[PDB]
């Protein structure tokens, strides 16, 4: 369907080793999107090809209120482009870099939406996400969670089926992954535990700048609990950050159903979470469609400037 010329390139949202994300406007509809533009040479050079094709399939195949939606994929001679829905609220990382701690109510709201999304990925799509983190969690214009970055997903993973790839983000890696063991979908609940910990405690549960020291903490140290934490929050964090995945909350046959039943989530009607009938704790305060106040000035102040990826190109329908 579309090419580079079907879009206006407005604001830089972010940039990294593999490319950039630009706030774009679709000429034909006036609708705003975020276009992820990756450098083919970098992707090939870093051996990222299968990840990019995995992200593409997972985005195409998923339809969920808390997963980032994809409208178009296409490519050029030297570029791969994902046109995704724009999330004006930025990353959770942006907000926690400024607030330091969310209230338990606010953390509960996001936690419930993340659970909803991961449950769908596991149960409906047979996908394990593997890279949950503050950077990959965005807020849409209404204040709802959007998971991003599906390049590390494992596809075709059923109930207890296991995985081998050493991957994720170092600070977030589960013990069983660091043990060099085959691991299952419960790695996602470890990642949920680290994210909830960060939201409610204002730091990672395990941290060293040195990865060997970091990995040692993850494997060896019990989590610390700030004295501000309520008992059900403590219990939830304690259960999600069990080092043995067989003992982790969500680590059995019932997967996410076990987390949903936990008393930390006692207020929560899961069908209302999905139907988005629960009032968000924060609505992004934007003055226009192009207000990028929830993206780093470092990026937004900047001016905008070998192989064929088979079966990449895509356009959404309904």
């Amino acid at each position: 369907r579309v090419t580079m010329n079907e879009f206006e390139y407005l604001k830089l949202l972010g940039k990294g080793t593999f490319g950039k994300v630009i706030l774009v406007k679709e000429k034909a509809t006036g609708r705003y999107y975020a276009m992820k533009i990756l450098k083919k040479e970098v992707i090939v050079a870093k051996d990222e090809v299968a990840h990019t094709l995995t992200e593409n399939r997972v985005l195409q195949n998923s339809r969920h209120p808390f997963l980032t939606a994809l409208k178009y994929s296409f490519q050029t001679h030297d570029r791969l482009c994902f046109v995704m829905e724009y999330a004006n609220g930025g990353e959770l990382f942006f907000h926690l870099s400024r607030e330091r701690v969310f209230s338990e109510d606010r953390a509960r709201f996001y936690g419930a939406e993340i659970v909803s999304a991961l449950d769908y990925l596991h149960s409906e799509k047979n996908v394990v996400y593997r890279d949950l983190k503050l950077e990959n969690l965005m807020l849409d214009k209404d204040g709802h969670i959007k998971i991003t970055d599906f390049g590390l997903c494992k596809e075709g993973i059923k109930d207890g089926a296991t995985m081998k790839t050493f991957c994720g983000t170092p600070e977030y890696l589960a013990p069983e992954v660091l043990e060099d063991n085959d691991y299952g979908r419960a790695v996602d609940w470890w990642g949920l535990g680290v994210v909830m910990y960060e939201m409610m405690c204002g730091r990672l549960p395990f941290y060293n700048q040195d990865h060997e020291k970091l990995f040692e903490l993850i494997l060896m140290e019990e989590i610390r609990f700030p004295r501000t934490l309520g008992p059900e929050a403590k219990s939830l964090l304690s259960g999600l950050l069990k080092k043995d995945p067989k003992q982790r909350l969500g680590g059995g046959s019932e997967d996410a159903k076990e987390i949903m039943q936990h008393r930390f989530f006692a207020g929560i009607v899961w069908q209302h979470v999905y139907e988005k009938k629960l009032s968000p704790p924060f609505k992004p305060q934007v003055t226009s469609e192009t207000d990028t106040r929830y993206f780093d000035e470092e990026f937004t102040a900047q001016m905008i400037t070998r192989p064929h990826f088979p079966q990449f190109d895509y356009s959404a329908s309904s």
């Binding site: 990840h51 990382f93 991957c167 994720g168 983000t169 170092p170 600070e171 977030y172």
Partner: peptide
Amino acid sequence: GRPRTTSFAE
């Protein structure tokens, strides 16, 4: 707080 993190695979 913490610096931005980086996803990886081996």
